[PDB]
Amino acid sequence: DLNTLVSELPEIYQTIFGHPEWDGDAARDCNQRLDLITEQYDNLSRALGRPLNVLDLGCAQGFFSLSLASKGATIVGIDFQQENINVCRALAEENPDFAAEFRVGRIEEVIAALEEGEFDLAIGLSVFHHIVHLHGIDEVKRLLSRLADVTQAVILELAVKEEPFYWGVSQPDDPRELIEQCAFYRLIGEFDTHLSPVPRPMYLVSNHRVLINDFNQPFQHWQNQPYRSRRYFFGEDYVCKFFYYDMPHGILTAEESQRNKYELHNEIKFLTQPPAGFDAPAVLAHGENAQSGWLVMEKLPGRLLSDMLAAGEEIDREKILGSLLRSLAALEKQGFWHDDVRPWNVMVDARQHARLIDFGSIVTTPSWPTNLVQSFFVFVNELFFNLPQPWSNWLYAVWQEPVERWNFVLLLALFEKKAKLPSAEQQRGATEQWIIAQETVL
Amino acid sequence: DLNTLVSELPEIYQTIFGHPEWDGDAARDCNQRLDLITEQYDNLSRALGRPLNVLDLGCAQGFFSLSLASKGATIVGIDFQQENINVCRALAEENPDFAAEFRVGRIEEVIAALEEGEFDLAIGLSVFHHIVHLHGIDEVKRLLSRLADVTQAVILELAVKEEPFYWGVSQPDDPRELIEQCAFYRLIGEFDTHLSPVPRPMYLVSNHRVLINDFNQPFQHWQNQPYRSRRYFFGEDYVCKFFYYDMPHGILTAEESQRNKYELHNEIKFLTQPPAGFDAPAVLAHGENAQSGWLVMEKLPGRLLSDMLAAGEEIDREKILGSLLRSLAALEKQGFWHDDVRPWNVMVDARQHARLIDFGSIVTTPSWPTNLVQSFFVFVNELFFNLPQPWSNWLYAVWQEPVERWNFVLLLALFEKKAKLPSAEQQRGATEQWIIAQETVL
Numbered sequence: 001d002l003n004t005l006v007s008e009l010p011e012i013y014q015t016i017f018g019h020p021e022w023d024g025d026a027a028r029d030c031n032q033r034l035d036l037i038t039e040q041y042d043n044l045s046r047a048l049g050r051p052l053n054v055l056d057l058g059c060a061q062g063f064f065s066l067s068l069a070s071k072g073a074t075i076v077g078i079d080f081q082q083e084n085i086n087v088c089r090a091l092a093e094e095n096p097d098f099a100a101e102f103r104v105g106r107i108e109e110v111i112a113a114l115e116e117g118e119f120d121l122a123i124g125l126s127v128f129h130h131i132v133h134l135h136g137i138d139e140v141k142r143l144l145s146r147l148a149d150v151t152q153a154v155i156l157e158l159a160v161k162e163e164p165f166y167w168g169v170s171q172p173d174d175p176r177e178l179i180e181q182c183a184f185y186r187l188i189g190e191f192d193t194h195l196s197p198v199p200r201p202m203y204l205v206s207n208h209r210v211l212i213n214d215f216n217q218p219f220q221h222w223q224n225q226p227y228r229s230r231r232y233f234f235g236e237d238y239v240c241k242f243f244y245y246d247m248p249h250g251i252l253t254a255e256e257s258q259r260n261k262y263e264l265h266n267e268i269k270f271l272t273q274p275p276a277g278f279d280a281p282a283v284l285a286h287g288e289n290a291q292s293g294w295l296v297m298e299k300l301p302g303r304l305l306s307d308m309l310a311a312g313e314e315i316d317r318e319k320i321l322g323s324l325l326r327s328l329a330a331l332e333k334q335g336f337w338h339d340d341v342r343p344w345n346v347m348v349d350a351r352q353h354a355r356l357i358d359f360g361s362i363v364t365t366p367s368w369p370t371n372l373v374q375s376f377f378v379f380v381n382e383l384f385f386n387l388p389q390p391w392s393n394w395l396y397a398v399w400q401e402p403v404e405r406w407n408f409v410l411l412l413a414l415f416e417k418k419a420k421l422p423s424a425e426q427q428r429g430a431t432e433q434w435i436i437a438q439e440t441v442l
Numbered sequence: 443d444l445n446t447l448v449s450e451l452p453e454i455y456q457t458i459f460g461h462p463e464w465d466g467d468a469a470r471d472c473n474q475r476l477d478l479i480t481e482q483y484d485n486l487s488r489a490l491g492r493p494l495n496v497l498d499l500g501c502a503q504g505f506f507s508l509s510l511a512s513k514g515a516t517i518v519g520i521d522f523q524q525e526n527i528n529v530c531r532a533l534a535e536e537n538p539d540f541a542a543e544f545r546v547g548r549i550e551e552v553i554a555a556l557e558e559g560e561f562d563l564a565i566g567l568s569v570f571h572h573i574v575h576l577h578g579i580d581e582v583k584r585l586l587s588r589l590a591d592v593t594q595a596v597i598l599e600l601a602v603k604e605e606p607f608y609w610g611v612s613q614p615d616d617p618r619e620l621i622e623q624c625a626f627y628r629l630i631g632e633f634d635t636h637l638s639p640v641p642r643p644m645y646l647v648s649n650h651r652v653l654i655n656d657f658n659q660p661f662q663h664w665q666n667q668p669y670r671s672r673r674y675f676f677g678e679d680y681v682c683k684f685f686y687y688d689m690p691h692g693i694l695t696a697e698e699s700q701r702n703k704y705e706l707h708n709e710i711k712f713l714t715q716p717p718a719g720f721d722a723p724a725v726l727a728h729g730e731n732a733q734s735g736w737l738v739m740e741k742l743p744g745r746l747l748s749d750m751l752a753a754g755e756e757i758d759r760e761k762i763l764g765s766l767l768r769s770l771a772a773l774e775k776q777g778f779w780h781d782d783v784r785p786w787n788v789m790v791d792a793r794q795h796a797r798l799i800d801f802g803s804i805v806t807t808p809s810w811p812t813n814l815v816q817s818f819f820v821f822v823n824e825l826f827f828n829l830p831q832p833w834s835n836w837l838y839a840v841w842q843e844p845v846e847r848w849n850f851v852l853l854l855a856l857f858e859k860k861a862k863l864p865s866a867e868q869q870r871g872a873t874e875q876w877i878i879a880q881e882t883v884l
């Protein structure tokens with residue numbers, strides 16, 4: 001009888017599915033976690049076009065497992081306590097059409113035995129802290145990596161060191177240390193455990209998909225360090241830029257988080273409303289919240305200029321500078337400038353034409369834009385002290401201009417006629433050269 | 443200069459690619475491992491239809507990496523010694539068309555950072571024993587699992603405890619303990635290290651493909667325990683049965699290995715030359731060697747009978763027994779019998795028709811086949827002491843037959859007319875019942 005099986009539970013941790021007579025006894029009601037988990041189930045089931053195979057690690061009394069089988073999922077629940085699995089099976093038998101199996105076993109051994117494709121979604125709620133406590137953080141990171149490797153999505157509720165109990169002392173400094181080796185992760189909620197006032201965060205993690213409520217797609221590779229608060233995911237015709245505003249440990253000062261926030265926000269604003277006369281990459285999706293923000297854009301051909309420079313690849317500096325200057329002059333005509341023209345913000349296509357790819361540093365108002373013209377000289381010099389004729393003649397001409405006349409329209413016009421300009425080395429000069437060489441050091 | 447870089451190597455472990463003046467100095471010539479690795483490169487490149495991305499872990503002086511880049515591979519080599527990477531890079535620069543990159547780094551951190559699809563083939567030759575020695579066997583198993591998870595194939599040369607040095611003591615009992623958690627593995631050679639007379643085995647490992655020289659295909663799931671010396675891999679229209687004759691530890695006695703060998707051999711012989719009047723599954727590939735044997739067959743629909751029995755699924759015992767008896771009678775007419783008719787050797791399709799799926803126990807000559815008819819009664823009883831009318835009447839009729847008349851043609855004929863046979867419970871009987879009930883216990 002169910003009555004007996006429930007009584008023999010060491011703890012009624014969860015609601016007993018279909019049996020509200022124990023709801024008052026359950027440590028956690030599970031309705032809040034279930035609301036969120038069913039939303040994510042539906043998103044992923046919609047994306048894949050079918051009901052999911054779900055793995056429930058430390059499934060306890062089966063509530064999540066049965067609740068998803070109720071919606072058509074095929075589920076396997078694992079728990080190392082016989083008493084818990086006895087209840088899960090007795091509940092499944094009351095619901096014979098649910099495709100639900102339960103097994104006694106250890107999460108560590110199950111994860112080692114998993115095969116990729118067997119399960120689409122795994123859930124691990126409030127269980128990994130027990131594995132941390134007995135086996136340490138590094139083994140848990142590897143288990144969670146494998147779990148992500150073999151599924152399409154993982155949902156974790158993770159206990160945290162701020163919880164007031166003795167086992168909190170063995171927890172990592174931040175729960176994100178258990179998952180940050182995985183490719184994609186997002187905080188999706190925080191839940192009251194009824195053990196204390198400290199809530200547990202729930203994360204959605206994937207090694208195969210971008211999972212954003214509006215955009216759910218496989219990616220084939222990703223990157224953290226460009227050229228660690230920013231991650232880039234590459235799919236067939238998209239790049240998803242994912243910025244963390246909220247990072248663990250020291251990592252971001254207040255100012256840096258706000259700048260992550262500012263840049264991504266500014267980039268979204270510009271790209272959703274670009275200026276006429278400028279070909280901006282197209283925007284497929286975007287959003288922001290307290291922890292992070294994201295932007296999914298069309299994927300552009302080419303390589304990042306700084307990589308080409310680092311990997312000593314052959315470059316046409318004329319075509320790169322010409323094309324970039326042309327786009328900068330067109331921006332300026334529409335009252336836009338870019339505050340940070342550097343090799344890692346420039347992409348060069350197969351025909352050696354260049355374009356900006358980060359619009360975080362775009363600005364709309366201001367003497368000016370004289371400073372930006374100055375840095376652009378450094379850019380030029382780093383792209384190559386190092387300027388042969390007629391690049392040097394170009395710069396010398398700019399330097400002879402009154403400063404109120406410095407702007408990107410002028411820079412471009414002089415650049416186009418640089419072969420006609422007088423020879424800098426024939427003049428006393430000589431300072432423009434030394435100031436940028438010191439700048440280009442500085 | 444290369445001269446200087448080579449001199450500064452703590453050890454010239456490998457041949458210096460393109461520079462035979464150091465071949466006499468190299469600890470290992472590498473030509474034997476390279477012959478085998480290039481063969482496996484070609485097989486996998488042929489299967490995938492393209493040049494491969496290859497990862498070389500602990501790449502030392504770059505010999506394998508450069509030698510594969512020479513054949514069109516794109517390679518990344520990793521080593522934690524700066525001196526080694528300096529030589530690798532200097533060699534790559536002598537061969538500018540090779541797509542070869544090298545990085546200083548630790549194998550543990552690289553594996554954690556890998557993404558699935560980035561590399562098709564990883565090689566790890568004589569390097570993991572260093573990671574075992576510092577981090578232990580369990581962490582190395584997890585690293586190797588992840589390596590297999592993220593690639594299509596892995597080639598490992600593994601040091602072994604029989605090597606006479608002090609670090610041998612930290613090695614596992616058998617090198618297969620580092621890899622047996624991976625889905626597919628095969629010994630492909632054994633190599634002289636020049637440190638001692640003990641050779642190191644080279645394994646080909648995969649978590650995604652069956653990699654047999656004649657048959658190279660993805661699989662989507664696999665299984666060890668049927669219903670651990672036998673593994674089954676399932677692909678789109680095939681099942682590959684892989685039997686180990688050579689197993690680690692105690693696992694197989696001499697007799698058991700020979701029986702693995704005998705069964706698989708016998709199954710290959712039968713299926714490649716099946717008897718007329720019997721629909722045998724078709725054979726796609728097969729082979730045997732000292733360590734193991736394999737058989738790739740067409741994949742049959744249905745479920746294994748023993749699973750259906752265990753998972754209490756609905757079965758039609760009439761249709762199952764009828765169909766099986768019909769095929770057993772047709773075998774017998776061609777002078778073939780099956781020595782081991784049990785639920786785990788029988789597959790039942792959607793229309794409840796049954797067939798044998800393991801032909802290891804097929805035999806061709808012998809009083810006989812009286813023992814087999816007897817077991818078939820146990821089979822019958824386990825499929826349900828437990829026999830209602832008219833199954834009991836069937837068995838009673840058989841038992842009244844002189845023993846020289848017991849055979850599967852008779853069993854089938856009586857089975858088809860069982861509704862007409864006299865009622866066993868009306869007779870003294872009663873023993874046939876008790877002998878099989880004791881047999882069915884026994």
Ligand SMILES: C[S@@+](CC[C@H](N)C(=O)[O-])C[C@H]1O[C@@H](n2cnc3c(N)ncnc32)[C@H](O)[C@@H]1O
Pocket residue numbers: 013014057058059060061078079080081084105106107108124125126127130131
């Ligand atoms: C605190 S409860 C969480 C239950 C459930 N996941 C939930 O959040 O509603 C932890 C559960 O995991 C199980 N468990 C703990 N460590 C385990 C392990 N190493 N393998 C399998 N089950 C484990 C316990 O038996 C218990 O049912």
Ligand SMILES: C[S@@+](CC[C@H](N)C(=O)[O-])C[C@H]1O[C@@H](n2cnc3c(N)ncnc32)[C@H](O)[C@@H]1O
Pocket residue numbers: 455456499500501502503520521522523526547548549550566567568569572573
């Ligand atoms: C015995 S040698 C084998 C070299 C090469 N794989 C071969 O078999 O021809 C081991 C190599 O691995 C490197 N190595 C050892 N442990 C390493 C680690 N943890 N990460 C990166 N490289 C490592 C050593 O620097 C050395 O080059």
Ligand SMILES: Nc1ncnc2c1ncn2[C@@H]1O[C@H](COP(=O)(O)O)[C@@H](O)[C@H]1O
Pocket residue numbers: 223225226227232239281297298299300301302303304344345347357358
């Ligand atoms: N729209 C895009 N299309 C292609 N690559 C991009 C795009 N946006 C960013 N990247 C790439 O993102 C990587 C590193 O991030 P980032 O700082 O954006 O350059 C570089 O390799 C860029 O080429």
Ligand SMILES: Nc1ncnc2c1ncn2[C@@H]1O[C@H](COP(=O)(O)O)[C@@H](O)[C@H]1O
Pocket residue numbers: 665667668669674681723739740741742743744745746786787789799800
């Ligand atoms: N030709 C085949 N087609 C489909 N399944 C097979 C075939 N051969 C073996 N199996 C399956 O292999 C699994 C376990 O191995 P076995 O002992 O061969 O039954 C069972 O689930 C069988 O259904």
Ligand SMILES: [Cl-]
Pocket residue numbers: 125126127128129130157158159
């Ligand atoms: Cl946890």
Ligand SMILES: [Cl-]
Pocket residue numbers: 138139142580581582584
């Ligand atoms: Cl580990």
Ligand SMILES: [Cl-]
Pocket residue numbers: 567568569570571572599600601
């Ligand atoms: Cl090794």
